[PDB]
Design an enzyme around this catalytic site. Sequence first.
Site, PDB file in Angstrom:
ATOM      1  N   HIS A  40      35.968  47.400  43.016  1.00  0.00           N
ATOM      2  CA  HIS A  40      35.063  47.500  41.790  1.00  0.00           C
ATOM      3  C   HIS A  40      33.595  46.807  42.137  1.00  0.00           C
ATOM      4  CE1 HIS A  40      36.848  43.528  40.608  1.00  0.00           C
ATOM      5  NE2 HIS A  40      35.954  43.281  40.127  1.00  0.00           N
ATOM      6  N   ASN A  54      25.702  25.926  47.299  1.00  0.00           N
ATOM      7  CA  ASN A  54      24.817  26.450  46.136  1.00  0.00           C
ATOM      8  C   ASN A  54      24.191  27.504  46.296  1.00  0.00           C
ATOM      9  OD1 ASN A  54      22.621  26.545  44.731  1.00  0.00           O
ATOM     10  ND2 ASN A  54      22.672  24.538  44.178  1.00  0.00           N
ATOM     11  N   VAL A  57      20.044  27.460  46.673  1.00  0.00           N
ATOM     12  CA  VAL A  57      19.245  26.733  47.726  1.00  0.00           C
ATOM     13  C   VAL A  57      19.849  26.698  49.033  1.00  0.00           C
ATOM     14  CG1 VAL A  57      18.540  24.192  48.244  1.00  0.00           C
ATOM     15  CG2 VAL A  57      19.115  24.775  45.527  1.00  0.00           C
ATOM     16  N   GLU A  62      23.674  28.354  55.975  1.00  0.00           N
ATOM     17  CA  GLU A  62      24.110  29.768  55.667  1.00  0.00           C
ATOM     18  C   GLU A  62      23.750  30.537  56.945  1.00  0.00           C
ATOM     19  OE1 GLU A  62      22.107  27.398  54.585  1.00  0.00           O
ATOM     20  OE2 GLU A  62      22.243  27.612  52.254  1.00  0.00           O
ATOM     21  N   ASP A  84      42.500  48.172  44.134  1.00  0.00           N
ATOM     22  CA  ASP A  84      41.188  47.406  44.080  1.00  0.00           C
ATOM     23  C   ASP A  84      40.923  46.392  45.209  1.00  0.00           C
ATOM     24  OD1 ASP A  84      38.687  46.494  42.986  1.00  0.00           O
ATOM     25  OD2 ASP A  84      39.762  45.137  41.945  1.00  0.00           O
ATOM     26  N   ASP A 171      41.173  30.211  34.534  1.00  0.00           N
ATOM     27  CA  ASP A 171      41.251  31.949  34.945  1.00  0.00           C
ATOM     28  C   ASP A 171      40.060  32.110  35.732  1.00  0.00           C
ATOM     29  OD1 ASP A 171      41.395  34.794  33.156  1.00  0.00           O
ATOM     30  OD2 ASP A 171      42.050  34.310  35.079  1.00  0.00           O
ATOM     31  N   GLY A 175      32.534  37.746  38.319  1.00  0.00           N
ATOM     32  CA  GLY A 175      31.594  36.936  39.481  1.00  0.00           C
ATOM     33  C   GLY A 175      32.254  36.404  40.347  1.00  0.00           C
ATOM     34  N   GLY A 178      36.516  40.201  43.738  1.00  0.00           N
ATOM     35  CA  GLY A 178      36.307  40.213  45.059  1.00  0.00           C
ATOM     36  C   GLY A 178      36.769  39.100  45.840  1.00  0.00           C
TER      37      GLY A 178
HETATM   38  N1  LIG Z   1      28.497  45.457  39.598  1.00  0.00           N
HETATM   39  C1  LIG Z   1      29.188  45.467  38.215  1.00  0.00           C
HETATM   40  N2  LIG Z   1      28.986  46.703  37.499  1.00  0.00           N
HETATM   41  C2  LIG Z   1      30.402  44.617  38.062  1.00  0.00           C
HETATM   42  C3  LIG Z   1      30.793  43.793  39.070  1.00  0.00           C
HETATM   43  C4  LIG Z   1      31.760  42.918  38.811  1.00  0.00           C
HETATM   44  C5  LIG Z   1      32.200  42.984  37.362  1.00  0.00           C
HETATM   45  N3  LIG Z   1      33.116  42.364  36.874  1.00  0.00           N
HETATM   46  C6  LIG Z   1      33.347  42.778  35.882  1.00  0.00           C
HETATM   47  C7  LIG Z   1      34.399  42.458  34.792  1.00  0.00           C
HETATM   48  O1  LIG Z   1      34.185  42.903  33.759  1.00  0.00           O
HETATM   49  C8  LIG Z   1      35.333  41.541  35.140  1.00  0.00           C
HETATM   50  N4  LIG Z   1      35.599  40.933  36.257  1.00  0.00           N
HETATM   51  C9  LIG Z   1      36.311  40.027  36.237  1.00  0.00           C
HETATM   52  C10 LIG Z   1      37.221  39.320  37.269  1.00  0.00           C
HETATM   53  C11 LIG Z   1      38.411  38.688  36.596  1.00  0.00           C
HETATM   54  C12 LIG Z   1      38.611  38.247  35.352  1.00  0.00           C
HETATM   55  C13 LIG Z   1      39.797  37.699  34.771  1.00  0.00           C
HETATM   56  N5  LIG Z   1      39.914  37.483  33.434  1.00  0.00           N
HETATM   57  N6  LIG Z   1      40.721  37.074  35.660  1.00  0.00           N
HETATM   58  C14 LIG Z   1      38.022  39.340  34.327  1.00  0.00           C
HETATM   59  C15 LIG Z   1      36.733  39.975  34.944  1.00  0.00           C
HETATM   60  N7  LIG Z   1      36.319  40.945  34.192  1.00  0.00           N
HETATM   61  N8  LIG Z   1      32.533  43.624  35.492  1.00  0.00           N
HETATM   62  C16 LIG Z   1      31.758  43.834  36.546  1.00  0.00           C
HETATM   63  C17 LIG Z   1      30.826  44.687  36.793  1.00  0.00           C
HETATM   64 CA   LIG Z   2      22.662  28.352  49.887  1.00  0.00          CA
HETATM   65 MG   LIG Z   3      34.813  34.564  44.507  1.00  0.00          MG
HETATM   66 ZN   LIG Z   4      35.222  41.872  38.312  1.00  0.00          ZN
END
Ligand SMILES: NC(=[NH2+])c1ccc2nc(C(=O)c3nc4ccc(C(N)=[NH2+])cc4[nH]3)[nH]c2c1
Ligand SMILES: [Ca+2]
Ligand SMILES: [Mg+2]
Ligand SMILES: [Zn+2]
Length: 223
Positions: A40, A54, A57, A62, A84, A171, A175, A178
């Site tokens: 996803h 970071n 920066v 890197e 996934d 949790d 972000g 993956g």
């Molecule tokens: N490029 C996009 N369109 C995108 C990318 C990552 C995303 N991620 C979510 C998301 O909605 C989302 N990623 C999650 C990962 C863990 C948990 C969790 N509660 N453990 C919940 C999450 N919700 N929407 C997304 C949209």
């Molecule tokens: Ca950096």
């Molecule tokens: Mg990560």
């Molecule tokens: Zn996600």
Amino acid sequence: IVGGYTCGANTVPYQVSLNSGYHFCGGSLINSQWVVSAAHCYKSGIQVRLGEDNINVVEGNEQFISASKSIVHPSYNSNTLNNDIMLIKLKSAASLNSRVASISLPTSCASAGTQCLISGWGNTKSSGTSYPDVLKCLKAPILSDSSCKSAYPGQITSNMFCAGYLEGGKDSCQGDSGGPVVCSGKLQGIVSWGSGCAQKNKPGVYTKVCNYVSWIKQTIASN
Ligand SMILES: NC(=[NH2+])c1ccc2nc(C(=O)c3nc4ccc(C(N)=[NH2+])cc4[nH]3)[nH]c2c1
Ligand SMILES: [Ca+2]
Ligand SMILES: [Mg+2]
Ligand SMILES: [Zn+2]
Ligand SMILES: [Zn+2]
């Protein structure tokens, strides 16, 4: 990561940041030329950044490499998020060192009870938005499939496992997607989904990587 801590610079050397102008997902390095992330997290035009801490920066350790190809799992269902997982090949091979290393794939699946490490640069607030610049870590145990399926009736498949705290507070979150879930030196999960983040009785759901080792191995050898 909500309720986690600052890992420390380059303490999680297999962690990667996927960037398409900004950091949008994490991934794990499995060898000098391949990365595993979530399907996803699929986008076109991705740069893989290694030795990051970071992400805003350039601290010197890197390696920014673009991907040559992305392979989403053939059976990935964007609706149930089943299977996934996605593989990313690098244009050049990364130079591995103390700050950039690969993680091993599992030989079997982990047991409920096992404590894992989940890391990422995703949101850190349950109610609110705060995005960190350094890597955040979270130690969390694998939960029984029973507690996972009660929380998510009819949504969990055998290619998913839950980890977290039912009380809430801690949790993985958007972000962190993956990103790696390492238990006993093996990459056992990929951050996949959950219900919001750090909510009581809503643990995170992770891709059960032990079900995809043959697929991963076969695919990188043929690509
Ligand atoms: N490029 C996009 N369109 C995108 C990318 C990552 C995303 N991620 C979510 C998301 O909605 C989302 N990623 C999650 C990962 C863990 C948990 C969790 N509660 N453990 C919940 C999450 N919700 N929407 C997304 C949209
Ligand atoms: Ca950096
Ligand atoms: Mg990560
Ligand atoms: Zn996600
Ligand atoms: Zn969400």
